[PDB]
XYZ file of C-alpha atoms in Angstrom:
723
model
C 7.225 7.914 22.782
C 8.920 4.626 23.653
C 7.872 4.844 27.312
C 4.179 4.711 26.379
C 4.698 1.708 24.091
C 6.676 -0.090 26.790
C 4.001 0.638 29.389
C 1.293 -0.718 27.091
C 3.293 -3.829 26.213
C 4.008 -4.782 29.822
C 0.436 -3.967 30.870
C -1.076 -6.164 28.140
C 0.635 -9.188 29.753
C -0.582 -12.702 29.017
C -3.468 -13.123 26.543
C -1.538 -11.321 23.803
C 0.831 -14.277 23.356
C -2.132 -16.605 22.870
C -3.912 -14.404 20.344
C -0.721 -13.669 18.382
C 0.271 -17.351 18.307
C -3.210 -18.327 17.122
C -3.146 -15.656 14.405
C 0.335 -16.560 13.161
C -0.328 -20.317 13.118
C -3.558 -19.659 11.222
C -1.681 -17.519 8.720
C 0.956 -20.215 8.316
C -1.624 -22.945 7.716
C -3.336 -20.706 5.161
C -0.036 -19.839 3.455
C 1.489 -23.324 3.242
C -0.138 -23.688 -0.199
C 1.442 -20.750 -2.069
C 4.124 -22.467 -4.166
C 1.646 -23.910 -6.674
C 1.410 -20.714 -8.759
C 4.725 -19.146 -9.820
C 5.984 -17.209 -12.834
C 9.081 -17.846 -14.945
C 8.922 -15.099 -17.610
C 9.428 -12.245 -15.136
C 13.123 -11.497 -15.658
C 12.467 -9.536 -18.869
C 12.109 -5.765 -18.670
C 8.617 -4.731 -19.754
C 9.539 -1.129 -20.601
C 12.070 -2.098 -23.265
C 11.139 -1.728 -26.926
C 12.472 -5.226 -27.678
C 9.831 -6.932 -25.531
C 7.099 -4.866 -27.189
C 8.484 -5.901 -30.584
C 8.426 -9.548 -29.497
C 4.825 -9.206 -28.285
C 3.744 -7.698 -31.611
C 5.609 -10.446 -33.464
C 3.966 -13.255 -31.507
C 0.591 -11.527 -31.880
C 0.886 -11.329 -35.670
C 2.646 -14.654 -36.323
C 2.035 -16.714 -33.184
C 4.454 -18.017 -30.594
C 7.033 -20.593 -31.671
C 6.868 -23.965 -29.927
C 9.325 -26.213 -31.787
C 12.213 -25.268 -29.469
C 10.566 -26.299 -26.182
C 11.459 -30.006 -26.437
C 14.261 -31.519 -28.529
C 14.897 -35.268 -28.365
C 18.096 -37.006 -29.458
C 17.355 -40.613 -30.421
C 19.758 -43.409 -31.375
C 18.912 -47.003 -32.371
C 20.684 -49.610 -30.224
C 22.319 -52.952 -31.042
C 24.450 -51.561 -33.891
C 21.423 -50.994 -36.146
C 21.085 -47.815 -38.190
C 17.916 -45.900 -39.063
C 17.930 -47.484 -42.533
C 16.042 -50.558 -41.287
C 12.336 -49.961 -41.890
C 11.149 -52.052 -38.932
C 12.967 -50.018 -36.265
C 11.108 -46.709 -36.544
C 7.732 -48.478 -36.379
C 8.114 -49.084 -32.638
C 9.122 -45.480 -31.919
C 6.329 -44.050 -34.073
C 3.736 -46.313 -32.442
C 4.956 -45.416 -28.942
C 4.852 -41.673 -29.607
C 1.459 -42.019 -31.319
C 0.089 -43.805 -28.253
C 1.543 -41.105 -25.981
C 0.020 -38.275 -28.012
C -3.287 -40.168 -28.192
C -3.238 -40.420 -24.394
C -2.498 -36.668 -24.327
C -4.194 -35.268 -27.439
C -5.256 -32.157 -25.510
C -1.847 -32.076 -23.810
C 0.359 -32.677 -26.870
C -0.767 -31.908 -30.423
C 1.837 -34.046 -32.180
C 5.466 -34.437 -33.186
C 7.946 -33.041 -35.719
C 11.033 -34.891 -36.895
C 12.734 -36.916 -39.596
C 10.551 -39.997 -39.030
C 7.426 -38.352 -40.475
C 8.877 -38.522 -43.990
C 12.032 -40.442 -44.587
C 12.281 -39.515 -48.217
C 12.853 -35.786 -48.298
C 14.424 -33.067 -50.451
C 14.220 -30.199 -47.974
C 17.643 -28.864 -47.105
C 16.367 -28.420 -43.552
C 14.991 -31.981 -43.027
C 17.955 -33.687 -44.616
C 20.067 -31.953 -41.951
C 17.770 -33.526 -39.340
C 19.773 -36.741 -39.815
C 23.465 -36.945 -38.942
C 26.240 -38.056 -41.286
C 26.798 -41.456 -39.644
C 23.049 -42.272 -39.457
C 23.413 -42.685 -35.679
C 21.681 -39.814 -33.841
C 18.550 -37.961 -34.960
C 16.752 -35.091 -33.227
C 12.977 -34.661 -33.159
C 10.841 -31.762 -31.957
C 7.849 -32.208 -29.654
C 5.761 -29.007 -29.560
C 3.717 -27.997 -26.533
C 0.706 -25.676 -26.541
C 0.144 -22.552 -24.477
C -0.693 -18.853 -24.509
C 2.287 -18.167 -22.215
C 5.008 -20.087 -20.422
C 3.422 -21.299 -17.174
C 0.837 -23.646 -18.701
C 3.540 -24.878 -21.087
C 5.837 -25.872 -18.230
C 3.082 -27.298 -16.014
C 1.861 -29.512 -18.851
C 5.520 -30.352 -19.464
C 6.380 -31.983 -16.163
C 3.284 -34.219 -16.153
C 4.382 -35.751 -19.482
C 8.094 -35.651 -18.547
C 8.275 -39.292 -17.338
C 6.046 -40.794 -20.038
C 8.064 -38.990 -22.722
C 11.408 -39.870 -21.113
C 10.712 -43.592 -20.666
C 10.135 -44.302 -24.380
C 12.505 -46.565 -26.346
C 13.492 -48.300 -23.114
C 15.011 -45.152 -21.631
C 17.412 -44.500 -24.522
C 16.389 -40.944 -25.451
C 18.057 -37.649 -24.513
C 15.671 -34.735 -23.961
C 16.681 -31.074 -23.796
C 15.340 -27.575 -24.352
C 13.953 -24.676 -22.348
C 11.457 -26.814 -20.382
C 13.968 -29.441 -19.133
C 16.117 -26.603 -17.774
C 13.172 -25.151 -15.851
C 12.306 -28.627 -14.564
C 15.885 -29.062 -13.344
C 15.776 -25.723 -11.515
C 12.527 -26.865 -9.889
C 14.200 -30.128 -8.877
C 17.259 -28.440 -7.394
C 15.039 -25.987 -5.503
C 13.097 -28.970 -4.162
C 16.245 -30.734 -2.980
C 17.522 -27.468 -1.480
C 14.230 -27.116 0.407
C 14.556 -30.711 1.629
C 18.136 -30.046 2.804
C 17.543 -26.580 4.276
C 15.695 -27.107 7.564
C 17.240 -30.505 8.324
C 20.732 -29.017 7.960
C 19.857 -25.732 9.682
C 18.302 -27.066 12.901
C 21.415 -28.881 14.239
C 23.744 -25.978 13.449
C 21.463 -23.374 15.030
C 20.981 -25.689 18.016
C 24.724 -26.113 18.551
C 25.516 -22.404 18.118
C 22.744 -21.491 20.580
C 24.161 -24.075 22.991
C 27.578 -22.442 22.573
C 26.419 -18.850 23.092
C 23.993 -19.579 25.965
C 23.920 -23.238 26.986
C 20.338 -22.944 28.260
C 17.665 -25.232 26.836
C 14.681 -22.858 26.916
C 16.680 -19.750 25.935
C 17.861 -21.683 22.865
C 14.544 -23.364 22.032
C 12.576 -20.097 22.088
C 14.298 -18.409 19.079
C 13.840 -21.584 17.012
C 10.069 -21.300 17.483
C 10.201 -17.522 16.949
C 11.868 -17.941 13.566
C 9.335 -20.570 12.537
C 6.401 -18.354 13.477
C 7.975 -15.311 11.790
C 8.624 -17.076 8.479
C 4.982 -18.197 8.388
C 3.887 -14.566 8.581
C 6.507 -13.628 5.991
C 5.153 -16.146 3.474
C 1.620 -15.039 4.334
C 2.398 -11.394 3.590
C 4.203 -12.283 0.369
C 1.176 -14.360 -0.668
C -1.132 -11.397 -0.039
C 1.120 -9.123 -2.097
C 1.445 -11.842 -4.765
C -2.342 -11.846 -5.123
C -1.842 -8.595 -7.069
C 1.584 -9.067 -8.699
C 3.142 -12.433 -9.662
C 6.221 -13.582 -7.754
C 9.195 -15.446 -9.232
C 10.458 -18.740 -7.823
C 13.766 -17.305 -6.552
C 11.912 -15.338 -3.851
C 10.924 -18.540 -2.012
C 14.117 -20.456 -1.119
C 16.530 -17.637 -0.226
C 14.875 -14.379 0.848
C 12.588 -15.842 3.515
C 15.438 -17.779 5.110
C 17.623 -14.667 4.926
C 14.833 -12.992 6.857
C 14.915 -15.966 9.207
C 18.686 -15.579 9.396
C 18.657 -11.872 10.140
C 15.570 -12.345 12.318
C 17.539 -14.665 14.601
C 19.972 -11.822 15.250
C 17.213 -9.621 16.672
C 15.925 -12.448 18.835
C 19.479 -13.266 19.873
C 20.048 -9.774 21.249
C 16.763 -9.955 23.150
C 17.421 -13.362 24.683
C 20.935 -12.121 25.377
C 20.461 -8.866 27.230
C 17.540 -9.900 29.436
C 19.848 -12.659 30.670
C 22.561 -10.231 31.743
C 19.874 -8.071 33.347
C 19.200 -10.978 35.702
C 22.856 -10.806 36.610
C 22.016 -7.224 37.796
C 18.657 -7.399 39.541
C 15.493 -5.458 38.631
C 12.580 -8.003 39.083
C 10.325 -9.901 36.686
C 7.748 -7.100 36.291
C 9.957 -4.266 35.168
C 12.576 -6.505 33.683
C 10.583 -6.072 30.568
C 10.345 -2.356 31.266
C 13.928 -1.626 30.464
C 14.708 -4.419 27.999
C 11.601 -3.507 25.995
C 12.722 0.124 25.681
C 16.254 -0.693 24.510
C 15.121 -3.568 22.280
C 12.467 -1.358 20.713
C 14.859 1.468 19.930
C 17.502 -0.828 18.435
C 15.017 -2.850 16.368
C 13.258 0.245 15.023
C 16.601 1.733 13.974
C 17.563 -1.529 12.258
C 14.160 -1.966 10.603
C 13.901 1.587 9.278
C 17.462 1.548 7.948
C 16.940 -1.827 6.244
C 13.665 -0.754 4.629
C 15.255 2.544 3.550
C 18.126 0.587 1.986
C 15.729 -1.795 0.214
C 13.255 0.849 -1.030
C 15.497 2.540 -3.684
C 15.403 -0.641 -5.798
C 11.670 -0.092 -6.384
C 12.516 2.532 -9.014
C 14.085 -0.254 -11.073
C 11.472 -1.684 -13.482
C 12.724 -5.235 -12.849
C 9.633 -7.117 -11.703
C 11.631 -9.968 -10.173
C 13.796 -7.483 -8.264
C 10.671 -5.636 -7.108
C 9.246 -8.926 -5.828
C 12.502 -9.626 -3.971
C 12.408 -6.161 -2.391
C 8.763 -6.579 -1.364
C 9.504 -9.971 0.192
C 12.589 -8.781 2.076
C 10.938 -5.593 3.379
C 7.850 -7.499 4.520
C 9.948 -10.200 6.189
C 12.143 -7.684 8.029
C 9.188 -5.590 9.217
C 7.075 -8.546 10.354
C 10.043 -10.280 11.991
C 11.072 -7.137 13.880
C 7.636 -6.140 15.172
C 6.123 -9.560 15.873
C 9.331 -11.021 17.321
C 9.964 -8.128 19.689
C 6.343 -8.292 20.855
C 6.340 -12.048 21.464
C 9.776 -12.197 23.114
C 8.990 -9.219 25.364
C 5.714 -10.789 26.480
C 7.316 -14.229 26.910
C 10.158 -12.884 29.057
C 7.583 -10.959 31.088
C 5.556 -14.140 31.625
C 8.228 -16.771 32.279
C 10.433 -14.555 34.441
C 13.930 -15.197 35.808
C 13.692 -19.015 35.991
C 15.553 -19.456 32.695
C 18.544 -21.204 34.315
C 16.527 -23.957 35.996
C 16.641 -27.125 33.870
C 20.188 -27.109 32.508
C 21.882 -29.819 30.484
C 20.999 -32.535 33.018
C 17.414 -32.664 31.696
C 39.432 -17.343 32.112
C 36.907 -14.844 30.759
C 38.688 -12.012 32.587
C 41.901 -12.996 30.794
C 40.037 -12.841 27.471
C 38.683 -9.391 28.356
C 42.187 -8.208 29.240
C 43.548 -9.595 25.973
C 40.815 -7.774 24.044
C 41.629 -4.550 25.886
C 45.327 -4.938 25.103
C 44.476 -5.568 21.444
C 42.333 -2.416 21.357
C 45.127 -0.393 22.979
C 47.665 -1.669 20.438
C 45.237 -0.848 17.618
C 44.568 2.702 18.807
C 48.239 3.399 19.589
C 49.525 3.239 15.982
C 46.956 4.209 13.308
C 49.250 4.843 10.328
C 50.922 1.447 9.856
C 47.417 0.052 9.412
C 46.149 3.109 7.528
C 48.503 2.358 4.634
C 47.090 -1.208 4.314
C 43.699 0.460 3.813
C 45.042 2.325 0.775
C 46.818 -0.724 -0.634
C 43.678 -2.862 -0.271
C 41.726 -0.031 -1.912
C 44.035 -0.359 -4.918
C 43.828 -4.162 -4.651
C 40.036 -4.001 -4.904
C 40.031 -1.444 -7.735
C 42.296 -3.680 -9.854
C 39.681 -6.487 -10.227
C 37.029 -3.884 -11.103
C 38.344 -3.654 -14.668
C 37.568 -7.353 -15.205
C 33.779 -7.359 -15.462
C 31.470 -8.962 -18.018
C 27.675 -8.987 -18.155
C 25.413 -11.398 -20.016
C 22.070 -13.190 -19.828
C 20.355 -16.309 -18.550
C 21.222 -19.549 -20.347
C 22.089 -23.196 -19.688
C 25.655 -22.225 -18.717
C 24.583 -21.857 -15.068
C 23.764 -25.530 -14.583
C 26.730 -27.651 -13.402
C 28.234 -30.080 -15.942
C 27.402 -33.090 -13.735
C 23.670 -32.994 -14.521
C 22.854 -35.196 -17.504
C 20.529 -32.610 -19.063
C 23.365 -30.178 -19.774
C 25.421 -33.117 -21.047
C 22.676 -33.836 -23.584
C 22.406 -30.135 -24.454
C 26.153 -29.774 -25.028
C 26.275 -33.015 -27.030
C 23.494 -31.656 -29.249
C 25.311 -28.329 -29.619
C 28.688 -29.941 -30.376
C 27.640 -32.652 -32.825
C 24.710 -30.730 -34.355
C 25.931 -27.193 -35.147
C 23.958 -24.095 -36.099
C 20.438 -25.359 -35.390
C 19.982 -23.134 -32.316
C 20.247 -19.387 -32.924
C 18.869 -16.090 -31.605
C 18.370 -13.815 -34.623
C 17.373 -10.192 -34.229
C 13.826 -9.109 -35.055
C 13.251 -5.921 -37.064
C 9.554 -5.023 -36.971
C 7.884 -2.779 -39.558
C 4.464 -1.359 -38.697
C 2.363 1.176 -40.602
C 0.326 3.884 -38.897
C -2.331 3.848 -41.632
C -2.640 0.057 -41.534
C -2.401 -0.579 -45.279
C -0.677 -3.755 -46.515
C 3.090 -3.474 -46.890
C 4.265 -3.332 -50.501
C 6.953 -5.831 -51.493
C 8.999 -2.916 -52.851
C 9.276 -1.495 -49.331
C 10.250 -4.958 -48.073
C 13.072 -5.091 -50.629
C 14.119 -1.542 -49.725
C 14.384 -2.419 -46.028
C 16.223 -5.606 -46.985
C 18.791 -3.470 -48.815
C 19.047 -0.967 -45.949
C 19.671 -3.783 -43.464
C 22.108 -5.465 -45.879
C 24.274 -2.373 -46.450
C 25.821 -2.890 -42.997
C 28.211 -5.818 -42.608
C 28.965 -8.019 -39.605
C 26.240 -10.625 -40.199
C 26.322 -14.381 -40.772
C 25.505 -15.870 -44.186
C 25.439 -19.688 -44.417
C 25.371 -20.240 -48.195
C 27.216 -17.034 -49.200
C 24.724 -14.963 -51.199
C 23.450 -11.574 -49.949
C 19.989 -11.983 -51.498
C 18.700 -14.815 -49.305
C 19.819 -13.087 -46.113
C 17.196 -11.330 -43.965
C 14.597 -14.045 -44.495
C 11.064 -13.335 -43.327
C 9.692 -15.087 -40.262
C 7.456 -17.999 -41.343
C 3.878 -17.683 -40.116
C 2.757 -20.104 -37.415
C -0.877 -21.224 -37.556
C -1.664 -19.594 -34.169
C -1.291 -15.953 -35.256
C -3.413 -13.550 -37.291
C -1.355 -12.348 -40.257
C -1.641 -8.558 -40.292
C -0.218 -7.224 -43.593
C 0.516 -3.857 -41.942
C 3.180 -5.386 -39.650
C 6.087 -7.612 -40.706
C 9.373 -8.954 -39.321
C 12.668 -10.292 -40.685
C 15.595 -12.052 -39.022
C 19.107 -13.401 -39.562
C 21.788 -14.897 -37.350
C 24.912 -13.361 -35.850
C 28.380 -14.636 -35.099
C 29.633 -12.879 -31.997
C 27.369 -11.809 -29.206
C 29.632 -8.968 -28.081
C 29.661 -6.985 -31.340
C 25.892 -7.057 -31.410
C 25.460 -3.962 -29.315
C 27.128 -2.139 -32.136
C 24.984 -3.864 -34.756
C 21.811 -3.287 -32.715
C 22.821 0.338 -32.148
C 23.389 0.830 -35.885
C 20.053 -0.830 -36.695
C 18.474 1.665 -34.305
C 20.398 4.396 -36.144
C 19.139 3.637 -39.662
C 16.095 5.539 -40.961
C 13.290 3.447 -42.498
C 10.822 4.976 -44.994
C 8.371 7.589 -43.724
C 5.272 5.393 -43.923
C 6.611 2.545 -41.772
C 8.104 2.714 -38.282
C 10.535 0.194 -36.839
C 10.970 -1.792 -33.634
C 14.193 -3.619 -32.769
C 13.910 -6.787 -30.700
C 15.342 -10.184 -29.826
C 17.259 -11.888 -27.053
C 20.345 -9.614 -27.420
C 18.302 -6.404 -27.715
C 16.527 -6.949 -24.387
C 19.837 -7.700 -22.659
C 21.440 -4.566 -24.115
C 18.442 -2.448 -23.099
C 18.528 -3.796 -19.536
C 22.281 -3.205 -19.241
C 21.962 0.344 -20.590
C 19.046 1.147 -18.276
C 20.818 -0.132 -15.167
C 24.058 1.619 -16.149
C 22.087 4.861 -16.511
C 20.110 4.544 -13.255
C 22.930 3.195 -11.053
C 24.496 6.570 -10.053
C 21.165 8.198 -9.173
C 20.108 5.144 -7.157
C 23.427 5.181 -5.293
C 23.093 8.916 -4.615
C 19.541 8.654 -3.277
C 20.489 5.614 -1.184
C 23.492 7.361 0.371
C 21.595 10.582 1.098
C 18.708 8.686 2.713
C 21.153 6.603 4.766
C 23.073 9.635 6.019
C 19.923 11.660 6.752
C 18.441 8.795 8.776
C 21.770 8.368 10.586
C 21.621 12.051 11.501
C 17.973 11.701 12.564
C 18.844 8.751 14.811
C 21.566 10.204 17.053
C 23.296 13.165 15.432
C 26.693 14.406 14.264
C 27.994 14.516 10.686
C 31.592 13.239 10.935
C 30.437 9.796 12.101
C 27.886 9.492 9.241
C 30.558 10.609 6.743
C 32.914 7.942 8.088
C 30.085 5.400 7.881
C 29.336 6.366 4.268
C 32.982 6.034 3.232
C 33.171 2.753 5.174
C 30.127 1.349 3.374
C 31.507 2.393 -0.015
C 34.817 0.745 0.898
C 33.199 -2.512 2.003
C 30.864 -2.792 -1.000
C 33.785 -2.193 -3.356
C 36.035 -4.576 -1.427
C 33.719 -7.584 -1.356
C 32.808 -7.257 -5.043
C 36.443 -6.885 -6.084
C 37.657 -9.843 -4.046
C 34.824 -12.164 -5.122
C 35.383 -11.324 -8.796
C 39.159 -11.675 -8.364
C 39.625 -14.876 -6.335
C 37.800 -16.968 -8.939
C 39.869 -15.482 -11.775
C 43.425 -15.484 -10.410
C 43.202 -18.939 -8.831
C 41.635 -22.242 -9.901
C 39.142 -22.147 -7.049
C 36.279 -22.930 -9.423
C 37.374 -26.557 -9.759
C 36.739 -27.403 -6.105
C 33.179 -26.022 -6.146
C 32.786 -27.254 -9.757
C 31.611 -24.147 -11.611
C 32.564 -22.482 -14.886
C 33.107 -18.828 -15.861
C 30.027 -16.933 -17.031
C 29.143 -13.234 -17.459
C 27.212 -12.181 -14.371
C 23.764 -10.610 -14.727
C 23.082 -7.257 -13.106
C 19.811 -7.289 -11.070
C 21.184 -10.037 -8.822
C 24.448 -8.209 -8.158
C 22.375 -5.101 -7.453
C 20.348 -6.915 -4.812
C 23.603 -8.310 -3.388
C 24.909 -4.744 -3.156
C 21.683 -3.884 -1.337
C 21.975 -6.770 1.135
C 25.671 -6.178 1.895
C 24.829 -2.489 2.332
C 22.107 -3.441 4.792
C 24.134 -5.923 6.826
C 27.365 -3.906 7.050
C 25.500 -0.708 7.872
C 23.363 -2.570 10.438
C 26.513 -3.722 12.216
C 27.783 -0.138 12.003
C 24.591 1.295 13.522
C 24.676 -1.337 16.266
C 28.196 -0.228 17.192
C 27.264 3.466 16.935
C 24.131 3.009 19.057
C 26.042 1.241 21.807
C 28.737 3.935 21.619
C 26.228 6.779 21.954
C 24.647 4.948 24.886
C 28.099 4.831 26.505
C 28.607 8.531 25.722
C 25.261 9.348 27.346
C 26.530 7.383 30.347
C 29.211 10.067 30.737
C 32.614 8.350 30.470
C 35.571 9.196 28.243
C 36.034 7.945 24.688
C 38.634 5.301 25.603
C 36.442 3.885 28.375
C 33.439 3.898 26.041
C 35.324 2.065 23.279
C 36.816 -0.577 25.569
C 33.579 -1.294 27.446
C 31.663 -1.345 24.158
C 33.984 -3.968 22.721
C 33.901 -5.971 25.959
C 30.121 -6.001 26.448
C 29.122 -7.191 22.962
C 32.101 -8.790 21.199
C 30.594 -12.216 21.846
C 27.171 -11.047 20.644
C 28.624 -9.640 17.410
C 30.629 -12.840 16.905
C 27.496 -14.950 17.338
C 25.534 -12.737 14.952
C 28.291 -13.153 12.359
C 28.403 -16.921 12.932
C 24.646 -17.261 12.354
C 24.936 -15.829 8.849
C 28.179 -17.720 8.189
C 26.341 -20.948 9.053
C 23.372 -20.118 6.837
C 25.726 -19.135 3.993
C 27.404 -22.520 4.341
C 23.958 -24.106 4.218
C 23.348 -22.298 0.930
C 26.744 -23.163 -0.556
C 26.032 -26.859 -0.030
C 23.389 -26.329 -2.736
C 24.066 -27.067 -6.400
C 23.017 -24.019 -8.440
C 25.979 -21.812 -9.342
C 24.322 -18.383 -9.112
C 23.127 -19.081 -5.574
C 26.624 -20.232 -4.584
C 28.005 -17.034 -6.135
C 25.758 -14.787 -4.056
C 26.431 -16.920 -0.964
C 30.180 -16.488 -1.484
C 29.698 -12.748 -1.853
C 27.647 -12.287 1.307
C 29.750 -14.713 3.377
C 33.102 -13.208 2.411
C 31.779 -9.655 2.845
C 30.283 -10.229 6.289
C 33.091 -12.372 7.700
C 36.195 -10.556 6.459
C 34.921 -6.980 6.482
C 33.133 -7.209 9.840
C 36.129 -8.879 11.492
C 38.534 -6.275 10.098
C 36.354 -3.288 11.021
C 35.565 -4.491 14.551
C 39.067 -5.714 15.395
C 41.194 -2.860 14.013
C 39.624 -0.267 11.737
C 36.833 1.255 13.864
C 38.764 1.889 17.133
C 41.729 3.303 15.212
C 39.634 5.632 13.051
C 37.316 6.887 15.818
C 40.246 8.356 17.806
C 41.308 11.198 15.466
C 38.605 13.887 15.533
C 37.635 14.088 19.208
C 35.330 16.738 20.670
C 34.911 18.427 17.277
C 33.073 15.309 16.072
C 30.090 15.851 18.380
C 29.817 19.558 17.521
C 26.691 20.407 15.537
C 24.911 23.576 14.379
C 22.016 24.976 16.387
C 19.316 23.898 13.922
C 21.056 20.507 13.715
C 20.375 20.010 17.437
C 16.958 21.679 17.688
C 15.445 19.048 15.389
C 17.235 16.372 17.429
C 15.644 17.541 20.684
C 12.241 18.148 19.053
C 11.512 14.766 17.456
C 11.927 12.929 20.759
C 12.053 9.472 19.164
C 15.699 8.964 20.143
């Protein structure tokens, strides 16, 4: 089947490059403007009962908006808030701002609206020393995106007031700071990537055109990637995190494909088969290797679709689309370009030994394959060494803890938390709804109050059981349905909540009313439980698909079993070492980050990407080995020539992703640096260890019994004809 495709691609010749370049540039120009519309409420699981409870609560009572913006204010020049003339300036300034933005801001809430007050809540608005006071600036909106987009436009006008002596914090400043750090990362990305990719391409080739071509190929492939993700975003919203990383990862991995192309054609010119059919061969081998890589990557990324995480689904869509488009379009354009330009690659040059290294590599391989036990025991000890960290795991949620302490916004947030205690809380929501729809009797409310009170472990500020479980006050933006009601109260320790939430789920309300449990801890617990339940089945389906496609590619079962165990080993190893190195040593101080319980969808996608990359290196090695076996030489000759012919190519492929991972770790956000550490350490250490020692030593044991296969295991191999 590949012969026909190769014949068509080298008969199409010239005009195809022009039409494809025109199409991809048009798509890129159309897709430049896709970052305007993004979503930020997509990390919540929609199938959980807690989110449904929250939706019913905000439908009946209206969404709360006092926690979006909190402003710490302090009078300067050693003057307290007692002076009556001081607050006049602040009130006039904020009144002018809200007048300028009456549609954009409705008003303000704080201590200044009524100095004389008897409310226990408003008296606490003012501190003991009469120095710092916090005010609340509500923002309107049906959901979060309009809230945030009206927030940044008033960000500077609200910040400048009182001569720049106000400290703003809340949920919206955090989102604005993530937008700012993504913007600076985008500014840094290309300008830091181009010199490093240029120098590594100069190192591996040293030819100006052979290095300039992949740079253009990556740029044209990413344009199509963003175009395809825009088309798929037209139906389903896409979270911001899909823009800065995934595409470039595509770019990163895409380079590898192009690298191999622009590599092997070169060595073909060392041989000698002519410009016309140079493509002939190179296209066949490039096509087979890229289709194997593409199908295995998409098969590794597809099992995550079963997860109901919308953000994770968007990431999987983006990565699958980028890999597919990069593979197909890049192989087409490079094949046609090498057909057109011909063998004159080494014409311009910079003006516009190696045998000893090969012998050393052969000696290293011989030493490796001579003694397999003294390095087999290190495998077991490092297995234990990676299992030991696995006990130390903690999972949490998204908060301000991610942001580095250097940013002034977290400094303001932590100052507010430290000096002003107890104002920010995340109480659980216990929803009562009636099937009939009749108004809820106060007797039933008291009964449910008692049933929720009978269990301990809750926080009571003024030490009387009666006033606990206070009803949610009704905001003026919700329709008060008497058939549905909610109550809430705070908690002391986040960890014990799963028990308290579980017990609240356990209790039996009266027959007439039915109960929802919700809140910020309930959604986290539901997500953790769901992923813990669906992890083994996802791993099983992933491993069976991987091994069945490995069998479909070339054959044999011992090699796929070794590959499966190898992938399990590497995914355990990288996770264990990345969770250990930060804990045992004070390595967090150098990169300036703090401990925090990791959240699970991201580590799942990291497992997916390390799976893909390690297994892609494995299938590259296996494909070259089976090519050598089809040549007809012995196993030792095949192993040595396989190491010799592509050690430099594998090293360059590893260096590309090491360079991009460095480019990411120069960023500021901690979670991104965490995933960059994971992928970098995995690729570098594990790939070096497997290529240098593990693979040659382990592939020497079985022998001829490895290639043996049942009759129906070979009939399907000869029938398909794809390989």
